[PDB]
Amino acid sequence: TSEEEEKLKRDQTLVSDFKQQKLEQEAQKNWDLFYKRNSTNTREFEELRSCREFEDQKLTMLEAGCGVGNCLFPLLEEDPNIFAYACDFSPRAIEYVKQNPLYDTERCKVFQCDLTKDDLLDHVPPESVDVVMLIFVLSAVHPDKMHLVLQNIYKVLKPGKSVLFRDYGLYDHAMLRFKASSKLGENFYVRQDGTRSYFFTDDFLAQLFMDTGYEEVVNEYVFRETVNLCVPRVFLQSKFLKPP
């Protein structure tokens, strides 16, 4: 190898770490910019009706990474005996959740929170929650910090109740198009809008949850289609239990 060949490889590491840190430093900005630049923004129901002891028993629920509430307001409208804590670290997204007319404070408490560093106990009482919902959120978090998210959620969960996980899986469509310029690491990619996407394997995700004290209930790939002309989709869909 040349002298410039050797130089270029140490340059690649250096620039790539610069890129990674900038992307991590601005995780919140890029998600906030995402919301400020757009507005065209069932397994869950089954498990809510599952842990109920009575028939119409009230349950309390934490939607971690609520966005503008696409997975929140439906669950509130179908089920009347459910209270949802909701957080997100994008202020603009929070405005949207507080701003649409379905928002009723007898049913829904939304707050800002960076799940990697802000204590959920600041706004969610300890071991108070029956279901936490991590839907397409963990994959936005740096793989090295994902366990922080799971540790944080742990404090909030009533023992014997569970996290409902769903996120991008191995060989999902986006992973199969990113130019290697956008690869940040193994299964870790950056989108054009600066937000990041991790593509989970069943084994890696299971290890994350067990390293932070959960037990595997369900951990399976699920496959779906999107219309263009059909696009194959791979999600990882799981359920992890906080032990009693």
Ligand X SMILES: C[S@@+](CC[C@H](N)C(=O)[O-])C[C@H]1O[C@@H](n2cnc3c(N)ncnc32)[C@H](O)[C@@H]1O
Interacting residue ranges for ligand X, rule: CB under 6 A: 31, 65-67, 70-71, 88-90, 93, 113-116, 135-137, 140-141
Residue placing its CB nearer to ligand X in the complex, 79 or 180: 79
The answer on whether 171 is annotated among ligand-binding residues is no
3-state per-residue secondary structure call for 151-200: HHHHHHEEEEEEEEEEEEECCCHHHHCCCHHHEEECCEEECCCCCEEECE
- Would you say 67 or 143 has its CB closer to ligand X? 67
* 15/166 with CB nearer ligand X: 166
The per-residue DSSP string of the chain comes to --HHHHHHHHHHHHHHHHHHHHHHHTHHHHHHHHHTT-----HHHHHHTTS-SSSS--EEEEEET-TTSTTTHHHHHH-SSEEEEEEES-HHHHHHHHHSTT--TTTEEEEE--TTTS-GGGTS-TT-EEEEEEES-GGGS-TTTHHHHHHHHHHHEEEEEEEEEEEEBTT-GGGGT--GGGEEETTEEE-TTS-EEE-B-HHHHHHHHHHTT-EEEEEEEEEEEEE--EEEEEEEEEEEE---
Q: Is 31 annotated as a binding residue?
A: yes
The answer to whether 160 is a known ligand-binding residue is no
Query: Annotated binding residue at 144?
Result: no
CB 135 → ligand X: shortest distance, Å? 4
Pick between residue 67 and residue 169 the one whose CB is nearest to ligand X: 67
CB of 211 to ligand X, least distance (A): 18
For the bound state, the minimum distance from the C-beta of residue 9 to ligand X, rounded and expressed in Å, comes to 32
Q: Which two tokens stand for residue 153?
A: 């959620």
114 is in an annotated binding site: yes
Q: How far is the CB of 124 from ligand X (least distance, A)?
A: 13
65 has binding-site annotation:
yes
Please report how close the Cβ of residue 180 comes to ligand X at its closest, in angstroms. Answer: 23
Tell whether 153 is in a known binding site.
no
Give whichever of 67 and 187 is closer to ligand X, judged by the CB atom: 67
Query: Considering the complex, what minimum distance in angstroms separates the CB of residue 5 from ligand X?
Result: 38
Tell me the binding residues. Answer: 31, 35, 63, 65, 88, 114-115, 135
Tell me the binding residues for S-adenosyl-L-methionine. Answer: 31, 35, 65, 88, 114-115, 135
Tell me the binding residues for S-adenosyl-L-homocysteine. Answer: 35, 63, 65, 88, 114-115, 135
